[PDB]
């Protein structure tokens, strides 16, 4: 249920493959999907979730560097997958930028994203 | 044990009074503490904490505006007070800046501060 294309509310596209071993591999890109806006993503998920109706815990990371650009930062998304007719991945993320020691206090942004299978 | 002057590891001074009703009132200022660096702080704390050795939950807010400067932002600290010879207040904070709708996704920074009674 996790493998496939996901869309958030900010105009980003998430394409991922969930392996039987708990691995998440894929690409994070812009709505357009141009080569310069594609980044590698890697993560992990619970490959044997509870059967009491609970969501599936997961998380992934994207370092904002590809063969064309580098933003010297990385974002990690932590959340859970909820299946069904209106399946979604509810997450909270942390975006950390490489900073000097003096600016370390303001190195991390926090937010939340909801991904759905439909735009 | 909460009333008094506290210092974090970033050169800031926290002066607060803990009311019997659970109110926290005081001022947040720089190491120096000049008029232009003083801001009002208000918060709440658990006035009847558990007696099993648990900390005392608390939180406070500071809007970064005074009669001289305005940073159009506000920080909230959430954490707990731990008494003893080495008393401390361990917190995690969220700093939100006023932004346009387009920049709302990067409006909040997250971090952590530890306050002690000694510099």
């Amino acid at each position: 249920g996790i493998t496939g294309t996901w869309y958030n509310q900010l105009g980003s596209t998430f394409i991922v493959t969930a392996g039987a071993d708990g691995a998440l591999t894929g690409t994070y890109e812009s709505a357009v999907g141009n080569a310069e806006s594609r980044y590698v993503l890697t993560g992990r998920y619970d490959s044997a979730p509870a059967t009491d109706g609970s969501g599936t815990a997961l998380g992934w990371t994207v370092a904002w560097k590809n063969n064309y650009r580098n933003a010297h930062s990385a974002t990690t998304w932590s959340g859970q997958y909820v299946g069904g007719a209106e399946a979604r991945i509810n997450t909270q993320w942390l975006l950390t930028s490489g900073t000097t020691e003096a600016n370390a206090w303001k190195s991390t942004l926090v937010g939340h994203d909801t991904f759905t299978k439909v735009k | 044990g909460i009333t008094g002057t506290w210092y974090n590891q970033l050169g800031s001074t926290f002066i607060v009074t803990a009311g019997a009703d659970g109110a926290l009132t005081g001022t947040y200022e720089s190491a120096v503490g000049n008029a232009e660096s003083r801001y009002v702080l208000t918060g709440r704390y658990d006035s009847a904490p558990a007696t099993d050795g648990s900390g005392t939950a608390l939180g406070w807010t500071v809007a970064w505006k005074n009669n001289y400067r305005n940073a159009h932002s506000a920080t909230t600290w959430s954490g707990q007070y731990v008494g003893g010879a080495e008393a401390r207040i361990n917190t995690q904070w969220l700093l939100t800046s006023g932004t346009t709708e387009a920049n709302a996704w990067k409006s909040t920074l997250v971090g952590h501060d530890t306050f002690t009674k000694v510099k």
Partner: peptide, 13 residues
């Protein structure tokens, strides 16, 4: 408006 990959940046700023 967006100048960081995360907000869906397409072209560089």
């Amino acid at each position: 408006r967006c100048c960081h990959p995360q907000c869906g940046m397409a072209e560089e700023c």
